[PDB]
Design a protein around this nucleic acid. Structure first.
Lengths: 63, 63, 57, 57
DNA sequence: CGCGCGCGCGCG
DNA sequence: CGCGCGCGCGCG
């Protein structure tokens, strides 16, 4: 859903750098639902992630 | 939700042995939501699983 | 054991897709891939890319 | 390297919880556990149970 | 189409 | 409280 993606981006716009944990717990969505859209949004260059070895990816808006 | 668990058990009652795949695709729920309740239902002895090494667990009602 | 058979296929045929390997060895694609990625971690095999192509060392 | 330090702690102190290990080694619990379970798979260490307790061989 | 994935995990 | 988990994976 576009609505889910809107809410994910709005969360990132409000909070900045975040793991899937911060996002899904706040939005009250499944972790998997959020990750699906995070990786989808990464593909369309709307979000980006940084990953330290063996750590949860950290996400933020490209803008 | 109890409703989710009801639907999972009803699926199993109708179809018998199933992986999380069969269930979540039919119920239109996230795989994680279904697995959460499967493992919860396993704990309360309402469902059981069999697992061949390196394969998806197969689930069925205890009854 | 499975890893032995995989490395042996590679040792004989060289560059191979997972498809080449599982077809010959009569094994599940997922099984062969699980072992290839573990062998990759072991620095025993490597892939080129997808349709990855695998080979020894 | 981390696995070296873990096995060395075990070699010196014997039966240890992940808590014992990470506190001494100054490492994340998740890091130590990831390596213990890999060493378990390697048949290098084993656990008794939870609060698992770990030791060599 | 890359896929190795089992995973439930929320955990502080 | 066991937790190692990263995981997005839907894939045929």
């Amino acid at each position: 859903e576009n609505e889910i993606e809107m809410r994910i981006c709005d969360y990132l716009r409000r909070h900045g750098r975040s793991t899937v944990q911060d996002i899904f717990k706040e939005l009250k969505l499944e972790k998997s639902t959020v990750n699906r859209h995070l990786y989808s949004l990464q593909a369309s260059k709307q979000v980006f992630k940084t990953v330290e070895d063996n750590k949860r990816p950290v996400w933020n808006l490209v803008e």
